[PDB]
Structures are given as structure tokens and as C-alpha cells.
Design a protein around this ligand. Structure first.
Ligand SMILES: *[C@@H]1O[C@H](CO)[C@@H](O[C@@H]2O[C@H](CO)[C@@H](O[C@@H]3O[C@H](CO[C@H]4O[C@H](CO)[C@@H](O)[C@H](O[C@H]5O[C@H](CO)[C@@H](O)[C@H](O)[C@@H]5O)[C@@H]4O)[C@@H](O)[C@H](O[C@H]4O[C@H](CO)[C@@H](O)[C@H](O)[C@@H]4O)[C@@H]3O)[C@H](O)[C@H]2NC(C)=O)[C@H](O)[C@H]1NC(C)=O
Length: 285
């Protein structure tokens, strides 16, 4: 009800009503999809002589030889299920005799708001869309991610900051553990029932419980001839005095446009080290 749902891990309240100010129109091949977040369609499409139905989503095969199919009825239900924000307009026109068309929007956290995109139609005639929008973001920590070297060259790692997912570090194929990392921000929300601590910018998964390997503090800087980003104040180290920390060493490699951080070392379950050759770490022009 009411186009809102609370995040059970962060406590913030997602409110997608600003996305329902107007009809949303999405082209997908020969189709145009119309839907209204938490409201009735105002567009002159998908007429129904059944008054008890309030149409909120419409699939239009454009002319020539066009047609309209009701793809979902009015709902203000927004669900948050194991880390995923979804809205499902149900009750559309009959499909393959035993189904009814539906329209499902998956909302993902984004730096801004991108136009929604049609993904696929499921075998039960559910039309799946993704919508990347800042409205789907729980709170996160963020630091400046641009910097200079001593010679005045400029650098910016901001494009490695990921809002809807996280970087999975590359370990040996035998490693039963895996590492999630983000850049100049805490981790993006994760699907599942075992999420990392909300304050973590780096996290160790595979043990009994996720482990926070450090929080955002300061941005990246050139130190001793290497670009370094450090996360601090993770979970307590086993010695009981220090808190876990993570160092990411970046190096410029123009060919490395879709690289991932590589796990280098974990010392005393306390200091974690990653190395990341990336075209993003090269001097800007
Ligand atoms: C958005 O929301 C909509 C609405 O919920 C989702 O659409 C539904 O998707 C599910 C798939 O996840 C569909 O389930 C399958 O449905 C088929 C067809 O079921 C119909 O025909 C059957 C054959 O005659 C009949 O038995 C069914 O009757 C049962 O279900 C209805 C409710 O739909 C209920 O009223 C009846 O009393 C019965 O309980 C029905 O008329 C079915 O064949 C599938 O069954 C297989 O799998 C299930 C496990 O999933 C298993 O239990 C079965 O034994 C069988 O192995 C399966 O149930 C569903 O039909 C869709 N609903 C409609 C109205 O089309 C949509 O997916 C959502 N989108 C997103 C992205 O979440």
C-alpha cells in the first residue's frame, strides 16, 4: 500500500511516488509499453468496458496490424524481498489461456535516474523492466574520488563506484571465500538473506557471517608512487585491538577497461590487500 516500503536493514523508507507523476512510456522493438507507477494510466490506450478494472500498464503493438493488451491493473504495493525492490502490476489480459499478463518493475539504486528498460517476457506473460533510480538507494557513505599527483596530473576513479552491485574480487579458483568491494562508497545492497554490514566498503563472504573489512574514510591518493585507497574500522581483528582494514592499489593500464580487483593478501585476518590495474586509473587528458 501507498507506494512505499521500509528497508529492514537500513531503516530508510523507499517512496517511489515521484516516479508516478506521469505515464512512463518505453519502446521495445515493435511494442510500446505504457505504465504509471502507483496510479492509473492517463494515456488513451487499453480501453476496458469492465469498470472495476483500473488499467495501469498497457502493451501496444504499434500499427500496422496493431493491438493493445492490458498488461496490469492499479496497485500501490511496493515490495522489498531479500534486498530487491519490486512493483508488480497484476491482472492483465488472458495469455496462453491459463495466465494473465502482468508488469513487473525491478528498481535498482543509481547515482541518478535512468530511463527504464524492457528486459524480457516470462513464460507466464510477465513483462519485466529494470529501472535504475536514486529513489531505490538506501543510505551509503561516499568520499571524493578524484585527486592529483605531484606533477599536477588529474585522476578520477568515480566511474568505478557502483550503485546497484559490487565488484567481486578475483581470487584463486580454489578459494572458498569471496570478497565484495566498492570504490569510494560503501557496498551497494545485495540480494539474499546474508547481507554485508551496511557500513562496509569491503566485505568477506563465505564464513559463518559476513565480515566488514573496512569503511570509507578518505579518497584515493598517490602514496609512494602508487595510487592507494584505504578502508578502515572494519570488524575487530582477532587480536582484539585493531579493526580490519583494506588497501586497494590501483595502477593505470589503458587496455584494462573491464578489469576486476585482484585479491593479494590477508595478514592476521586484519589487513587485506587488493591490486587493480584499470584504464580508469590513467591520467586524464
Ligand atoms: C507478477 O505477479 C503475477 C501474479 O502472481 C505473476 O504471475 C504468476 O506467475 C506464476 C509463476 O511464478 C504462475 O504460476 C504458474 O502458473 C501455471 C498456470 O497456472 C494456472 O493453470 C494451472 C493449470 O490449469 C492451474 O492448476 C492453476 O491453478 C492454481 O493456481 C491458481 C493461481 O494462479 C489458483 O487460483 C488455483 O487454485 C491453483 O492453485 C492456474 O489456474 C501453473 O501451471 C504453474 O504450476 C507449476 O508450478 C507450480 C510452482 O510454481 C507448482 O505448484 C505446480 O504444481 C506446477 O508445477 C505455476 O503455478 C502464475 O500462473 C502467474 N499468474 C497468473 C495470473 O498468470 C508474475 O510472475 C509476477 N511477476 C514477477 C516478475 O514476479
Amino acid at each position: 500500500d501507498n507506494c512505499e516500503v521500509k528497508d529492514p536493514r537500513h531503516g530508510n523508507l523507499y517512496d517511489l511516488k515521484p516516479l508516478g507523476l506521469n505515464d512512463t512510456i518505453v519502446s521495445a522493438g515493435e511494442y510500446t509499453y505504457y505504465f504509471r507507477v502507483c496510479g492509473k494510466l492517463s494515456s488513451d490506450v487499453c480501453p476496458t468496458s469492465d469498470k472495476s478494472k483500473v488499467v495501469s500498464s498497457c502493451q501496444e503493438k504499434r500499427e500496422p496490424q496493431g493491438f493493445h493488451k492490458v498488461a496490469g491493473l492499479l496497485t500501490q504495493k511496493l515490495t522489498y524481498e531479500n534486498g530487491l525492490l519490486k512493483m508488480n502490476f497484476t491482472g492483465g489480459d488472458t495469455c496462453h489461456k491459463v495466465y494473465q499478463r502482468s508488469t513487473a518493475i525491478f528498481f535498482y539504486c543509481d547515482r541518478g535516474t535512468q530511463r527504464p528498460v524492457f528486459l524480457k517476457e516470462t513464460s507466464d506473460c510477465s513483462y519485466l523492466f529494470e529501472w535504475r533510480t536514486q529513489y531505490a538507494c538506501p543510505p551509503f557513505d561516499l568520499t571524493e574520488c578524484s585527486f592529483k599527483d605531484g606533477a599536477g596530473n588529474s585522476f578520477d576513479l568515480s566511474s568505478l563506484s557502483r550503485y546497484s552491485d559490487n565488484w567481486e574480487a578475483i581470487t584463486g579458483t580454489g578459494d572458498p571465500e569471496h570478497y565484495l568491494i566498492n570504490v569510494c562508497k560503501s557496498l551497494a545492497p545485495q540480494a539474499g538473506t546474508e547481507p554485508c554490514p551496511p557500513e562496509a566498503a569491503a566485505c568477506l563472504l563465505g564464513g559463518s557471517k559476513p565480515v566488514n573489512l573496512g569503511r570509507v574514510r578518505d579518497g584515493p591518493q598517490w602514496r609512494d608512487g602508487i595510487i592507494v585507497l584505504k578502508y578502515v574500522d572494519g570488524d575487530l581483528c582477532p587480536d582484539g585491538i585493531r579493526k580490519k582494514s583494506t588497501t586497494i592499489r590501483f595502477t593505470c593500464s589503458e587496455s584494462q577497461v573491464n578489469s576486476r580487483p585482484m585479491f593479494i593478501s590477508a595478514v592476521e585476518d586484519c589487513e587485506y590487500t587488493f591490486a587493480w590495474p584499470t584504464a580508469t586509473a590513467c591520467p586524464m587528458k
